[PDB]
Each structure stands twice: as C-alpha cells, then as structure tokens.
Amino acid sequence: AATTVNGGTVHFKGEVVNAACAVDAGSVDQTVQLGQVRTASLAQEGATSSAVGFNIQLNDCDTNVASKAAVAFLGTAIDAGHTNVLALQSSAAGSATNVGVQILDRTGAALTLDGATFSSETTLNNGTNTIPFQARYFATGAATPGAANADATFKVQYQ
Amino acid sequence: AATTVNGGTVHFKGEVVNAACAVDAGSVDQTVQLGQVRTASLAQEGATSSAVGFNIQLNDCDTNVASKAAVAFLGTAIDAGHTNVLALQSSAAGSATNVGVQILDRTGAALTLDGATFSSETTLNNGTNTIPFQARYFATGAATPGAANADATFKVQYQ
Amino acid sequence: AATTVNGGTVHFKGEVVNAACAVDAGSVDQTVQLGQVRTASLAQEGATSSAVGFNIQLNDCDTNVASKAAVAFLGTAIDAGHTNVLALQSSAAGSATNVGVQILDRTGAALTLDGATFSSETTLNNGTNTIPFQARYFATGAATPGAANADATFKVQYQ
Amino acid sequence: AATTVNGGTVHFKGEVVNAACAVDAGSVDQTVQLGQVRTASLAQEGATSSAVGFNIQLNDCDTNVASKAAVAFLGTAIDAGHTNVLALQSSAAGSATNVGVQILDRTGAALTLDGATFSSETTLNNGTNTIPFQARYFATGAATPGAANADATFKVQYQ
Amino acid sequence: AATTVNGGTVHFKGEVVNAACAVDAGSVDQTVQLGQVRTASLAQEGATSSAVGFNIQLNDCDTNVASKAAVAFLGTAIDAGHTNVLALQSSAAGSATNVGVQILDRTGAALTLDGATFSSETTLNNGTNTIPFQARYFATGAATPGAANADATFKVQYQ
Amino acid sequence: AATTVNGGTVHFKGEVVNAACAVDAGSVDQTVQLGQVRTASLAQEGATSSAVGFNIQLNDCDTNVASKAAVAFLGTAIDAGHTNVLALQSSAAGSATNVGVQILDRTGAALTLDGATFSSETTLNNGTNTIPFQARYFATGAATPGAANADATFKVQYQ
C-alpha cells in the first residue's frame, strides 16, 4: 500500500561569482521596514526623517586576493536635480508625492544612484563580513499622505 | 585589478501619514506566538484560555494636535453569532475547529472585528507611547486538534 | 602575524528627554520576583497576599526646574469592575485564574491602570531620588493553581 | 477631528493539541547561542567541545492523564555513520567543514536524529515542568574555519 | 509645569500553588558562588572538594495540611555511570573537563539528578522553614583548567 | 497509550574560528542599556554625558600562539567630521537629533568607527580574559528629545 501522490515543485535560486567573497543568501533579496512618518516632519525641501539601518554580509572572504570592498546602488532618481534620491513605486494611484528615499554610506553621506559611484572602502578579514548602511526619507517639496515603497539593486567591487 | 560582480536587491517598505503620531517600524507587521493549548481546556461553548500580550508603539507624538488615541481591528469573524472572534486560516487541511482568537482591550473587554468599533481611549504624551493588548483562544463548541493561525489589521483614530 | 577574526554585535538602548530628572539605567527595565503564593490565602474576592517592594530611581534631578514628581502606570485590567488590578499574561495555557496583580503607592492605595491617574506627589532634591512602590496579589474569586506573570509601563510627571 | 489613519497587520501563531501538557509559547521556536570555538580544539574525528544548555518547558500538566514524558529530535544527519550528529546549514558558501552539532539527553548521551528514538523519560508533576538539554560541537576530521548554524525539530511523547 | 515623560517597563514574576508551604522569593532563583578550586586536589576519579552551603526557604507553612517536606533535583548528568553529578555548561569553549558538580543532602549523601528520587524528609513547623544543602566538585578523571558553571531545578514534595 | 504530538523548532547559532581565543556566547550578541539623558546636559557641540560600561569576554585563550589582543569597531558615522561618533537608528519617525554614541577604550580615548583602527592592546593570560569598554552620548549641537538606539559590530586581532 504505497499510495503515491503528487507533491509539488521546488525552485532554486543562486549565482556563481569569480570574486574574493560571496554575498550571503539572506542579503541577496531583503525587505527593510521603515515605518510610518508624519507629514509635519516633512514640510520643505531638504527635510529628512530618522534613519533605519540594514546590513549586507560577505561570506568566505579571502584577504590574499582582495583587501577592500565597496558597494554601489542603482535605481530611478526622483528627478534630474536630485541624483541621490530614490523614487516611490507602488501602483498607479496611492503613492505619496514630493518625497523620496536616500541611502546613507558608512560615513553618513548620501550615495548617488547611478550604478557607478561606489561607497567608501572597508577593510576585510577572512571569514564573515558585514557592511553597515542606513536609509531615510528626503522631502523635495510639501509632502502629502500616501504609500512609500522603493526598490534598488547593488553591485560589489573587490580590489 | 578591481573585480566587480552583481549583488542583489533591496526592497523598502513604508508609509506617510497626516496624523499626530507614527506607528513604530517594529509594530507595522509583527507575529505573536500564542503557544499550544490542550483540548481539555476547551470543552464547551464560551470556554477560554490564558492570554498572551502584545503592544503597539507610537512614536513622535505631539499633544498640541491630539491628546487621545484608539485602535480598531478588522478581520474575518468565525460566525454570524460571534462577531468578536477571529477565524483560523492556515491552509485547506489541518486546522482546528470550533475555536477562534479573541483580542482584548486594555479594559479586559473583547473587540468587535468590524473596523468601526474603536477601543477605549488612552491619554498620550510627547514622545514614545505604548498601548497594551492581549489575545486568547475562544471555544465555540468542542475543540479538535489542529493548527491555529490568524491575521488581522488595525487602524488608529487620533481624537 | 595579525590573525584577525570576526567578533560580534553590540546593541545600545537609550532615550533623550527634556525634563528635570532622568530615569536610571537599571530602572528602565526591571524584573520583580513575587514568589509563590498558596491558594489557601486566596479563597474569595477581595483577598490579598503579602507585598513585595520595588522602587524607581531618578538621576541628575534639578530643583530649579521642578519640585515634585508622580508616576502613572498603564496596563491591561482584569475586567471592567476592577480597574486597579493587572491581568496575567504568560502563554496560552498554564496561567492562574481569578487572580491579578495590584500596584500600591507610597500612600498605600492601589493605582488605576489607565495611564492618566498619577500617584501621590513626592518632593525631590538635587542629585539622586528614589520613589518606593509595592506589588501584591489580588484575588477576584476562587483562585486556581498556575503561573502568574505580568507587565506594565509607567510615565513620569514633573509638576 | 477623528483623523483616522491606516495601521498595520498582526499575525497570530499557535496550535491545539490533545495531550496531557502543552508546550510553552517561549519554547516552540527558540534560538541557542553556542558561541565561537577554536579550530585547535577540533583536530581529529570524535573530538568534542564544551556544552551549552537549553530547556523545553511544559505547561498545564495533568498527572492523571499521563505521568512521564520524552522527546525525540528530527534533522539532517551529517553522514551515514554519524546519525547522531546534526549537519550545518547556513548558506551556499562560508560554512565550517567536518564538524556538526550534537544534542545530549539528560543522561549525558547523544540522541539519534531520526524522529523515532525518544530520549529518557522524566516524571511530571501538576503545573509547569522543565526538561534540560545540552548542545555541543562534534568534529568528524580536521575542522575548517567558517560559520556553524543548524536547525532541528522535536516531538513529545506523553506516555 | 506639567511635563510628562515616558518611563520604562516593569516585569512581574510569580506562581500560585496549591500546597502547604510556598517558596520564598529569594529562593526561586539564586546563584551560588563556589569559587576557584586547584586542579592539584582533583587528580583522579572520586576526588572531591570542599563544600559550599545554600538554603531553600519555605514561607507560610501549615502543620495541618502537611508535616514533612522533601525536594528532588533535575539536571543533565555527566555520564551514564555518574547519575548524581551535574555537567558543566557555560559556552562552547573554555570549560573544564572531567569535573562535575555534586549536590549533597542534609544527611550527607548525594542525590540522583533524575527529578524523581527525593531527599530525606524534614519536619516542618508553622511559619518559616529552611532546608540546608551543600555543593561540591567531583572529578571523573584528570581535571583540566576552565569554567565550572552549572544549573539545575528542584521540585518540592509535601507529605 | 503513547499520544505523540508535535513540538517545535530549535535554532542553533555559532561560529568556528582559527585564533588564539574564542568569544564567549554571552558577548557575541549583547544589549547595553544606557538609560535616559536630559537635554540640559547636551546643549553645545562636544558636550558628553556620563558613561556606561560593558565587557567583551574571551575564552580558552592560549599564551603560546599569541599574547596580546585588540578590538576594532565598525558602524555608521554621524558626519564626515565626526568619524568617532555612532549614528542613531531605531525607526523613521522618532529619534534624537544632533546626538550620537561614542565608544571609549580602556585608555579613555574614543575609537574611530571604520573597522581598521584597532584599540589599545591588552596582555592576555591562559583561561578567561575580559576587556573593558565604555559608552556615552555625544552632542553635535542642540539636542532634541527622542529615542537613542544604535548598533555596532566589532572584530578581534590576536597579534
């Protein structure tokens, strides 16, 4: 009485890289919860809210190949005058206006979202590594209620 | 040289609101572990179990705009006669029956899961605020072994 | 050689306030051990047990800004008829029944757990100040064996 | 001026069982921090390390229904001849080699990770209960630097 | 004027039992400082060390319900041939080997750490009672330097 | 009968390193409570509050492979000219402004949070070792009430 049935399907995602380190499986696709923000704290150009931090791990590093590392982000800018601010993208209607998302480097400086400007270097050691990062909102004009979600991709430079 | 490889993706979640307080990032989406409960403690209609507490945190409050707040929950009722009991929803097979989840206010009273009846008001103060809540199982009959998971959403009224 | 290895992570907790005093580090989050109690001493409604003492310590107080302080406690009541009794919350099963936790002021009167009614005032002095408090069990009926854990939050008023 | 705004989502997790006791909400999903271990302490097959303890707590126990309890762990073995040694799993790259984790019973003996061989029985009493356990590393050869995380599941027998 | 500031959190721990006596708050959870021991005194199997005393205090005892009391200890044994010796557990590294902790009854004998074999009975009187105990090291083989932390739990059997 | 039921999941976390010592399980992930601080003590740039101490514990040290150790910290700075000040990150709504966190060394000097500038070396001994550290707030300007949470990571050099 075997009583064999059909179970389903399993999908595997991965990548093979020729580099000194390998990005951790928990950092290739992660979601950061920023939380709600009051419009009273975003009332003029240049106003910023508080910051939320996230990390990127590097496994199996080898210092005999490379000793430094840097991360550069790529995404859609809010306009041509603010090249370091992300643009919100949730749906056709519902997103807020005159607001964006900034990414702060290890030195507290905003990162240009062009995919070529890399962050500050960080010395590595054999084994696991961690590179800190922060995110925050950045008002451009008068903020309005709505949703605020954004996506971005990053690349790593070992040298 | 300077080896560059592809990295991953980062997804940002948030919301902008026009209110006197903002929900904390750790309270927008949280899970509560109720733990196991014996069927012998749920034998007849109206029987309950011990409660488990969870909190909702409000940040950056201002008492010059509003001085009180209330929370109303929304979810699927278990029956037309039990409007204040949630219904279990995990999968198509392998869930308990004749049991539900109740949400208790800070006055020990059950909350109607219609999204309109708000809980008891609580005086706020400038800065961080916390609102207590409790959850417990409610039996509408004879309990049956199985899984017990539920979901609900809340809204905040700043009166 | 050097032989550098990965270490760990350190988390820092704190708060910046605008008031005459500041809560001590050991009083921000503390645990009070009530100890066991016999059901024979809790037989009917209104019965109480012995009290266990705890205190809140204030630091860097200044008498030129404020002169008196008071504390209000917020928590989940046991029912609508007993607003000064805190409800137990440990897990889904294994908690005692028809029993709660009462918090007594330095005057010996139980405080309502609504976050608005403050305790009796106490004159302060420059430097370190401590405010005494007591906790005891309270029975609303025939007590049953089980666990008895509870949590509460407090706010400080500087009048 | 109600000024109602959207909040968030709450997820509830639990289970209903027909047994003499119920597992504590704090023991259905727990993390054990083993800490770092030097490679010099793991040089040949069969070499172990120091132990770290963890507990499983049972609530609302009834002696009439049952008087003894035992558990059995299920997980992925590291090898065909090492069925009592759990295999590490953290990511594709960056994990220690030739080493696993062992789960010791209250009699100091290892446990087969097949989900069928239960541990030594323990007498119960009415109310809460605690069962002790220990975990340690186990070398199957020359150890290699890396990360070491693992997972397992357990079941309870109320004989 | 009326500056209100958020404070902190208070946690209460306790238990309600149906028995003749209740355990004092100072004996529910306590730490015993054994101090350092030279490895020269622990050189072969069966070697012991000097004893360190600790007490378990019972409150509100009644001589009508019960007349005598006894306790049993439950913990992880060091080996299958040594069932009355605890096993050291502090971390994955830096712990002593071939050394365990032995608990002695008021009669001078060592108790088995199975949670079923209770110690010698002790006559009680109305009011407060204390039960003496002693702890010492026990060498299974040749001692090695390291830490010697341990933990255990006890149950009281009124009769 | 047996009446076997389902339990839960156990998560094990650890690391295997090739170094002179190993970090204790209690020091790889710890929380430090700083307590509240008044804005009156943080009014100008360079003003500092009191200090709170914490330790990093090393186990199973060997004095034949290495004799001295050092610790370097990594985190997100608050400004380009304040590389020795850590930035606050709790949420996107409520956090103190112009206030950071400094990490002092056993020499009393602040450490640069770049992950390369190690602290002052300390002589080790065979067995357990402890390295002291202190943390404090640092004001870059006029302080603002809010939360003051922060995180950081460290690495060890066994020179």
| Start-end of H helices in C46-136 | none
Residue F140 CA to residue C61 CA, distance in Å, equals: 24
CB–CB of C15/F147 below 8 Å?
Answer: yes
Residue F21 CA to residue F69 CA, distance in Å, equals: 9
- Does residue E108 sit in helix, strand or coil? coil
| Structure-block tokens of residue A109 | 């400086």
Residue D81 CA to residue F139 CA, distance in Å, equals: 60
Residue of B nearest to C96 (CA): B50
Residue C29 CA to residue C66 CA, distance in Å, equals: 24
Dihedral of CA E29/E31/E32/E38: which sign?
positive
Experimental approach: cryo-EM
Distance from CA of C88 to the nearest CA of F (A): 24
E strand or H helix at F59, and its extent? strand F48-61
Residue A132 CA to residue A57 CA, distance in Å, equals: 9
Which residue in A130, A158, A134 sits closest to F15, CA to CA?
A: A130
CB–CB of D2/B159 below 8 Å?
Answer: yes
Residues in contact with A95: Cβ distance below 8 Å, sequence separation at least 6, in sequence order: A88, A89, A146, A147, A148, A149
Residue of F nearest to E91 (CA): F25
State residue F75 phi and psi, 5-degree precision: -175, -175
Place of tokens 């608005």: C116
Chain C residues with CB inside 8 Å of D25's CB?
90-92
Biggest distance spanned by C-alpha atoms of chain D = 73
Which residue in C158, A22, A36, A121 sits closest to F36, CA to CA?
A: C158
Distances (CA, A) of F21 to F12, F133, F158: 21, 18, 8
Residue of B nearest to E6 (CA): B128
Residues in contact with B82: Cβ distance below 8 Å, sequence separation at least 6, in sequence order: B100, B138, B140
Beta bridge partners, A124, equal none
User: For residue E27, what is the DSSP state?
Assistant: H
Which residue in C147, C146, C141, C124 sits closest to C57, CA to CA?
A: C124
Interface B-C, measured as beta-carbon pairs within 8 A, has a size of 76
CB–CB of C102/C140 below 8 Å?
Answer: no
Distance from CA of C139 to the nearest CA of F (A): 34
Which residue, among B64, B123, B126, would best test binding to E if mutated, counting the most E CBs under 10 Å from its CB? B126
Cβ neighbour number for residue B40 with a 10 Å cutoff:
16
Ranges of each domain in chain C: 1-159
Query: Would you say how long chain B is, in residues?
Result: 159
User: DSSP per residue over D108-134, as a string?
Assistant: S-B--TBSSS----EE--SEEEEEEEE
Which chains have 3+ CB pairs within 8 A of C? A, B, D, E, F
Residue A12 CA to residue A35 CA, distance in Å, equals: 31
Q: Resolution of the deposited coordinates, in angstroms? A: 2.8
Region of C90 please: left (phi>0), alpha (psi -120 to 50) or beta: alpha
Cβ neighbour number for residue D49 with a 10 Å cutoff:
29
Q: Give the burial string for F64-102 (b: 16+ CB within 10 Å, else e).
A: eebbebbbbbbbbbbeeebbbbbbbbbbbbbbbebbbbb
| Structure-block tokens of residue D138 | 């186990």
Which chains have 3+ CB pairs within 8 A of D? A, B, C, E, F
Tally the C-alpha atoms within 13 A of residue A76's C-alpha that lie toward its C-beta. Answer: 7
Residues in contact with D52: Cβ distance below 8 Å, sequence separation at least 6, in sequence order: D32, D33, D34, D35, D134, D135, D136, E89, E90, E91, E92, F25
Cβ neighbour number for residue F3 with a 10 Å cutoff:
14
Q: Do chains E and A touch (3 or more CB pairs under 8 A)?
A: no
Residue E75 CA to residue E115 CA, distance in Å, equals: 8
Residues in contact with E53: Cβ distance below 8 Å, sequence separation at least 6, in sequence order: E132, E133, E134, E135
Dihedral of CA E28/E29/E30/E34: which sign?
positive
| Start-end of H helices in chain D | none
Q: Which of A23, A32, A37 sits opposite B12 (nearest CB)?
A: A32
E strand or H helix at E28, and its extent? helix E25-28
| Structure-block tokens of residue D93 | 């790259």
- Does residue B145 sit in helix, strand or coil? coil
Burial of E64: CB neighbours in 10 Å, binned 0-12, 13-18, 19+: exposed
Q: At F150, which amino acid appears?
A: A
